[PDB]
Design a protein around this nucleic acid. Structure first.
Length: 191
RNA sequence: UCGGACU
């Protein structure tokens, strides 16, 4: 029986992150490409937000290990495709990634912690089909604790069109999981 | 339908 208040939790002065309005993708481009993207008087990002109909932020350093920086691509399926096309377009013009190859940028999208095997599929068939046929590769970290929403990240490395078919096959399987999570009882079912 | 890919 409850008598006194148990667990409240407010704001943490240790870690603070601003949540966007609509749905969000987080696109990992080179830290040698932020000077590219923010570079034009700091007006190319203020450009992509008006231009791509989307809501673009730049994010701080991930880690010393990460030579990228994360771009906040918020907005509809139309405005999301319009903005990322530019960030893939800019590495396409400069080839910041690796002169010998073509654009292969990392995508972070929050997905449910016990649904991280849904995005990878049957053992590694969604990672195998995406890597080989799509060149966009699904990644889910080892020392991975979930977020607030009980959500973990997955990291695709592909082109604009490759991360396109990969990101969408992910949010669909993750939908079909959300279908099996909400919907359970169907028909009559005998014991 | 779906379970941990990555050396």
């Amino acid at each position: 029986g409850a008598m006194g208040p148990s667990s409240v939790s407010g704001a943490a002065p240790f870690s603070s992150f601003m949540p966007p309005e609509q749905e969000t993708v987080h696109v990992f481009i080179p830290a040698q490409a932020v000077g590219a993207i923010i570079g034009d008087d700091g007006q190319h990002i203020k450009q992509l937000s008006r231009f791509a109909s989307a809501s673009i932020k730049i994010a701080p350093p991930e880690t010393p290990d990460s030579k990228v920086r994360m771009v906040v691509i918020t907005g509809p399926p139309e405005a999301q495709f319009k903005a990322q096309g530019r960030i893939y377009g800019k590495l396409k013009e400069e080839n910041f990634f690796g002169p010998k190859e073509e654009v292969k940028l990392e995508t972070h999208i929050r997905v449910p912690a016990s649904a991280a095997g849904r995005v990878i599929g049957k053992g590694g068939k969604t990672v195998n089909e995406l890597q080989n046929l799509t060149a966009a590769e699904v990644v889910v970290p080892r020392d991975q604790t979930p977020d607030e929403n009980e959500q973990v990240i997955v990291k695709i490395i592909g082109h604009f069109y490759a991360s396109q078919m990969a990101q969408r096959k992910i949010r669909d399987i993750l939908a079909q999981v959300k279908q099996q999570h909400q919907k359970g009882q169907s028909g009559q079912l005998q014991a």
